[PDB]
């Protein structure tokens, strides 16, 4: 179902986790020390240099339906790889951009999704830096957002009513998390502890505001 | 309030963004053209040897609560303006780690937060290979996703998750009544079990 | 009608020899040096990064019918231009390859057609070592060929019935050479007169053997 | 017969092409790889930096009655090699030229033939670029050209007189692989049939924009 | 007992010293002919990247209580091997500093002992400088020095008192490799004896200028 | 009175000290930053090229009865300046030598004193290493030794007659050091106070042994 | 009259001593330091790239009859120098060669005179270490040598060399008289047989 | 009684030549390649690290009346081995200098002869340079000079009393050189074709003049 080109600080990462979800992958790389280094993480692991045509067959490329092409640093070897598997009809090619200029040629030999992930780290966190309180949030719309937020001090050991956030700031707690065993819809008496993850849902303005002042 | 001390594919991200969503960002780089181009990105933009003691100090680098170190390539470059950081009491210092080694010495010498960016991004996309049918998720699962013309009461998804929000036009309905239609392009907000929601994503789409 | 996007050993030559057939060429470089040079061998020179989006618009770029992207090293720099250039419709991008490699992203961003020169002179080369005679030729079919000759010390100060071509080997001869004024159909063949010759490719080879 | 000295772009594609005429080769090159690669595609393949006497006479050098230095970049070592092929009396030597200033000592020091690729080919496609139409040509003077070109159609020399009309003489028809080679006033010229027409270059030309 | 990572002019100089001093040592260093030349003044001497982890373990680097890490110009390799050490548990590791930032790193990856050479040896070299003439000496404090002295020839302890008219107390006489520990009143100095001072600075001093 | 020419680890580490000693001296370095850098650390600080005769006569250079040629990394630089400082008639120059070679040199070329700090802090760190317990020695005999001990747990909190170290090793306790105020000759002894040992090096060896 | 093209070891040398003598010669260098260093060493110094035709042109050397190439290590720019200036028709061309294969190019780009400066003072030093006695000769030899108060019949010489002057006190006896004294700093200038002289120093020094 | 510790260019070049001219040299150098090389060129050649002491001692270094050091560009190396001839009491010790600092030390540590080639043959080029027809000459006083010339053309075939110089110019010719057969002192019928070797003496203008009028 899936295979991944370049076993880098990217590829190595998308390898793992894929097989750590269950899916089978196919891990590639030129070098026998990643491939030996993946074979644990991978349903398969092979030696091979992506930008020749015959070793492409050989792995039997055709049989994925997503081929993750992750070489990062070498431009030229990222687009000739992407160019051989565009020829072989792979129904998704997915690739990380270098630069602009990269991102450009990716987009024109017919790439189906270009990432560049330092870019998309660095919006990722300014939004941690901006609110250190969010560990995570979905966007509703405009004004609605539901919010992880992790449990700052002052908010140790109370309970909802103690701190009644529908009254208070018209937002409905969703969700408590202790050790890792969760209070999915709380009773108007459980105990919030500190680095307890709190799930809160509303007015973006309403949340901002119960961070101002119960945290 | 914010400082980003390298403008690259990484702290370059990191500036534009905190300076669209409001906050002010002083921008530090070494290399001029750098540091021209992100003029319009960021409060301030200088040129500063991250380095150079004298510099930072120059930069009125302690005025800020937040410095972010993004030289990335650089492992010396990096790790020495962490230590000079650390010297002048910022009370927060975020690096990108270049590899396991870097996140040590990092660690060390008293790096507030480590940042491995391809690493992370890595996970999130073997997430989004997955499953390609998520918009959005947070895990507790909360999951953002893109069963035509049919109600709330039409697939009864209690009888084991909970629909939380549909989004049609860009006007939310928050907490749907029994009898609340979702179109083709709307945005399923579902909670729950994780595997409960594949299941209604397998079944239901 | 005519833009060299770059004047190097290979861009350059294109341009001065389209200014010497008399079209008119428009000249881009982004050295300042190379667009003063060429100055009086195109109708315009002008200085610019071709892989500057709004510069190209500032050329004119579309007003051309034909661009031949001349950048040899930088592989880079010539497939952003070459990229560019299919995005503003250009109706013909020439473009000299470096590589196998960059002659296939060139193939998938539509270049129209793609040039490697030294391995196509390495061909023509290979042509004039093999036989020292020959100049210039033209393949009719399997059998057939038009080729120019220089004439050798053997055929000097001879006329066309001294050694008749049409008897002896059954070939025609359509030209001859003497010094930059041809004879186009008892004419006087002296060295290194240019002779061009047509029929069948083994009775060429039979009257170079022969009478050269 | 043939050495080859550089396998690169340019001696590689000469080597090759050699090669496939059926000449005998020996293919050089410093670079192991480069000498792999060529294997198939030459008699011999030997490394050897050919800036080295001694590896020059270790080849057998002498035996060869032509020796192409090709190896563009390093202007030293293409210079110092063609020093070296001079002194061991090579009947000719054929050398890249790299620039001006590399045809300067390559002359003085006494290369046979100096190549320049990129100018050459430079020519070549800027007379492509004049008359796309053209499939071949042969240029005989400034003026005078040999054209082979692709309402013509059912058509006979009678019916379309050119001597007269344009002042070219057709030389040929191409149909279907079996070619007229001397097109009798009645020879009817179907669409896709190759014409060989010659003449003053502007006649043609005019009879380009008239006839189709 | 002992390993020295850095043979170079400050490890080497350990090495050979604690060698000479009769403790085992193991002298390791990347470079081999450094491993060739310490191979007499060390236990045992191996080829290793100090930096590489597996090459630590087999160099049985735990199984020393002291491990120095003398490689000087080096930063990055210099701290990742400390960083190394500290991992393998080693109860002291000793660092060359390079500069102060250096020492930071050091300081935090948790060295045991961090010595700058020639800041050191700066200090020792002043104190030479000052009191040229006092064959050696020991500071007490910032005031008080035990000083060894090489006028005062054929003079007794009573015949020249020290504890009244300087304030300080001779602790030793050297005649000839045979020490007078404390001497009594009447014990002559005779030249060349090594006289061993003991109290404040400023009094010998004077004891120098007046007495010799 | 001194002269240091070269600010560097070890020249500025000198120069500091002879200063905070109350000596004067100058400071002398070809780069601005170090000199600015030095101005408080010296009775006068110059911007000099000492390798430069004449920046040496502008100096007053001999004026000077010690000049310390501190310049590490250039060893051209540092033989040069030991050179034109021995035709100057300087009574004492001392020059740190890189390595084997530069001590050569310097030696023939009429250097005083030639220092190697990495060499000789090796030493004492090798000293240090092999006891841990001591800081600081005198030796009077192959016999006799002065040493400064850095006091364990062991005898924290006990005074002179606790431990009698006059009947027990027979050695003689000198000084105690507590916190940078000597006792110079029933006084309690706390941890990390400075033991001034004296007499046969076997008894202080033993009384570690025990004691500590 | 004299260009010099390379101000170093070797170019310099023939620049100051030109210039000692009197004639008028221009000094060239891509080195700003070395054209400083022989403003007074030269009627003119100037900054060039030698190996720039536009920038020789600039230097009018074409107004020169004899242009010496003294770059020495960089192989490459010498000839390409020598190259441009038999280009501009300089009647004398004076290099420096490097090694065996540099002269070889040299002589073909035609090169006047190739020099080969170590090669020749090897010579000259083996002719003094071989003979530490004569000061200056002329092979034909003729031999300047440094007998005290002895008359050139006290030692007659023809009877098989010809002494040929005495030098004492910067005052010289050209053709000396039968009777004229030779003290001990004194210049003898000798002239036949090279053995017959050698013979002379063997035994009458 | 010679041994050269160079065989460079220069270094080479004096011991090919000492060996021509009939003397033994003792040829060292570090490289086996210039060794070999020089196996034909003197007495005897041998392999050697001159910077290294006993090796010195081996070679019979002491046995030398005079060393020549001659490693141009290792400016230590050349100093080190200058060092340890000092150290051996080798009574004539000639080095070759770099650059001026280098002379500077070498003069300190007692070489006895210091040279300078390039500086020194710039002299003697410059000297060609100024009269190209001046082969050679001897400086007798301020004003006298004995000069070997090399024939211009219009000297050709002429005999001594045909350009009477002891009249005209009033100098001397000593000497004829045809075919490397002299004409030691010239009858006054001898004739002077071109390319013969004048030797000429007496005043420095005068001979200068007759450069000017009889060539
Ligand atoms: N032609 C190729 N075929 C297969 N794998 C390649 C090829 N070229 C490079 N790689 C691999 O791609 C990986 C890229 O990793 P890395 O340089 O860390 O990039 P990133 O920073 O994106 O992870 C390397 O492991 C490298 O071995
Ligand atoms: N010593 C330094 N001081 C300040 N800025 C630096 C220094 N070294 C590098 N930088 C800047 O930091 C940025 C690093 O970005 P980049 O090379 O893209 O790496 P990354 O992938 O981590 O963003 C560059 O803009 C660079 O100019
Ligand atoms: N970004 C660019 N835009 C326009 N012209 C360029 C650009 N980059 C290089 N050039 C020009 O293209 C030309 C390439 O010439 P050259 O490298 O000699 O190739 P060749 O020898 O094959 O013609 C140079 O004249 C250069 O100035
Ligand atoms: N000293 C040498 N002896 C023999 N072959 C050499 C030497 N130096 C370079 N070569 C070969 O000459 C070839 C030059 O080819 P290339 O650089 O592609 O120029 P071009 O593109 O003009 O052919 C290279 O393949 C290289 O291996
Ligand atoms: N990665 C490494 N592992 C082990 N030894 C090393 C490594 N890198 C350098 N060394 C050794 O450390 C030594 C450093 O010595 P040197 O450069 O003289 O510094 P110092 O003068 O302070 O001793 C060198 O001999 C070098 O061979
Ligand atoms: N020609 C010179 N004249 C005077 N000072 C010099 C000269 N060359 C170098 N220096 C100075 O000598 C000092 C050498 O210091 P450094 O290289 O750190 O040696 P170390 O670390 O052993 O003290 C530097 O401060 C440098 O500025
Ligand atoms: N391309 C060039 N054009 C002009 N002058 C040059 C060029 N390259 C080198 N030079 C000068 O020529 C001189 C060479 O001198 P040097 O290196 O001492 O060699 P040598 O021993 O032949 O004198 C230097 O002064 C250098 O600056
Ligand atoms: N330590 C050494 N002992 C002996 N010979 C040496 C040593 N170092 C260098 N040499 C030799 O000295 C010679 C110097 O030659 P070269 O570099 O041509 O100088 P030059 O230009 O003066 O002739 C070389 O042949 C080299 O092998």
Known sequence: ???????????????????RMGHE??????????????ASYATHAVIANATEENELLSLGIRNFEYVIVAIGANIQASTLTTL????????????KAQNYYH??????????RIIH?????????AQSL???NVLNYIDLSDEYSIVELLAT?????????DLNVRAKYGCTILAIKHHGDICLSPAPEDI????????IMGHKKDIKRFENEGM
């Open 130 to 132: 901006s609110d250190e």
């Open 192 to 199: 919030i502890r500190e680095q307890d993850c709190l799930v």
């Open 103 to 112: 991102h450009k040629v990716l987009e024109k030999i017919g790439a189906d």
């Open 153 to 161: 001090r002052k908010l140790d050991s109370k309970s909802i009513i």
């Open 25 to 38: 992958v196919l891990a590639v790389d030129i070098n026998e020390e990643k491939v030996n280094a993946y």
């Open 84 to 95: 051989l598997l565009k020829e072989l009809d792979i129904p998704n090619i997915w690739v």
């Open 1 to 19: 179902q899936f295979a991944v080109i370049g076993l880098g600080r990217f590829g190595g990462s998308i390898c793992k986790e894929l097989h």
């Open 117 to 125: 992930p330092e870019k998309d780290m660095g919006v990722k966190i």
